[PDB]
């Protein structure tokens, strides 16, 4: 922890606070978040201790209210910046949440979520993201719009961060998408897929990537290797 005054606002994160987050009726739901949102401006600097939140957080952020799971994105927002590198501890819960929401059809949901993403990673570091496959996981089942945000933000981020904040084993995890939406049928997903092939290969090597395109036989090896042999003379 640094060295700022921090309150910390479990106590705050009472029964009835999560009970009214999570009414059936949706306009409760929204008055939870109106009380929620104005503990964490009164107190503007928090502790990493949120009691249960969390978790309550993370199912208003796959809200079936659109304007609830809106909401909880500026939330989620709102307490990081409060949060400051506290905010790393929450990332297991939070983050499959704004991974999801990078698939929504309106793109001010996607750029909320994004946002969400990359200040939870300045804010906490982006090595707790690249851990238990939640990105292979969106990726995975991941609607055309989600893989298209995930791997422009993979293409991104991943050449500018040292080894040591990204696990090889969770970058492994994404080779068989990689392989897959190199040759997708969506030309988006095409462009953003081949654009994050040199990100990877930073972080695994050629001879790693090489060594799983020969293991896995995926379709159309040709092009997947012809892709791999495009981004090496590129590697630092």
Same mark, same amino acid.
């Given at each position: 922890?640094?060295?700022?005054?921090?309150?910390?606002?479990?106590?705050?994160?009472?029964?009835? &606070?999560?009970?009214?987050?999570?009414?059936?009726?949706?306009? /409760?739901?929204?008055?939870?978040?109106?009380?929620?949102?104005?503990? !964490?401006?009164?107190?503007?600097?928090?502790?990493?201790?949120?009691?249960?939140?969390?978790?309550?957080?993370?199912?208003?952020?796959?809200?079936?209210?659109?304007? !609830?799971?809106?909401? /909880?994105?500026?939330?989620?927002?709102?307490?990081? /910046?409060?949060?400051?590198?506290?905010?790393?501890?929450?990332?297991?819960?939070?983050?499959?949440?704004?991974?999801?929401?990078?698939?929504?059809?309106?793109?001010?949901?996607?750029?909320?979520? &994004?946002?969400?993403?990359?200040?939870?990673?300045?804010?906490?570091?982006?090595?707790?993201?690249?851990?238990?496959?939640?990105?292979?996981?969106?990726?995975?089942?991941?609607?055309?719009?989600?893989? /298209?945000?995930?791997?422009?933000?993979?293409?991104?981020?991943?050449?500018?961060?040292?080894?040591?904040?990204?696990?090889?084993?969770?970058?492994?995890?994404?080779?068989?998408?990689?392989?897959?939406?190199?040759?997708?049928?969506?030309?988006?997903?095409?462009?953003?897929?081949?654009?994050?092939?040199?990100? !990877?290969?930073?972080?695994?090597?050629?001879?790693?990537?090489?060594?799983? &395109?020969?293991?896995?036989?995926?379709?159309?090896?040709?092009? !997947?290797?012809?892709?791999?042999?495009?981004?090496?003379?590129?590697?630092?």
């Amino acid at each position: 922890a640094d060295l700022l005054p921090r309150v910390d606002i479990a106590p705050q994160i009472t029964e009835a &606070l999560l009970k009214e987050m999570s009414d059936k009726d949706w306009k /409760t739901r929204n008055e939870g978040l109106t009380k929620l949102q104005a503990i !964490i401006s009164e107190a503007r600097l928090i502790k990493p201790s949120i009691g249960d939140l969390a978790p309550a957080l993370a199912h208003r952020l796959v809200d079936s209210n659109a304007k !609830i799971a809106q909401t /909880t994105l500026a939330i989620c927002e709102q307490l990081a /910046t409060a949060m400051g590198a506290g905010c790393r501890n929450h990332v297991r819960n939070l983050f499959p949440g704004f991974l999801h929401a990078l698939g929504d059809n309106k793109s001010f949901v996607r750029a909320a979520a &994004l946002n969400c993403i990359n200040s939870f990673g300045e804010k906490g570091g982006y090595k707790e993201f690249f851990e238990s496959e939640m990105i292979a996981d969106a990726l995975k089942g991941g609607s055309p719009a989600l893989k /298209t945000e995930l791997w422009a933000w993979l293409a991104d981020k991943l050449p500018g961060l040292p080894p040591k904040s990204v696990s090889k084993e969770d970058i492994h995890s994404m080779v068989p998408h990689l392989y897959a939406h190199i040759c997708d049928r969506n030309a988006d997903v095409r462009k953003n897929a081949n654009e994050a092939v040199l990100g !990877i290969m930073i972080h695994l090597g050629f001879d790693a990537m090489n060594r799983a &395109l020969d293991k896995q036989k995926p379709a159309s090896k040709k092009d !997947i290797l012809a892709a791999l042999e495009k981004a090496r003379p590129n590697l630092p």
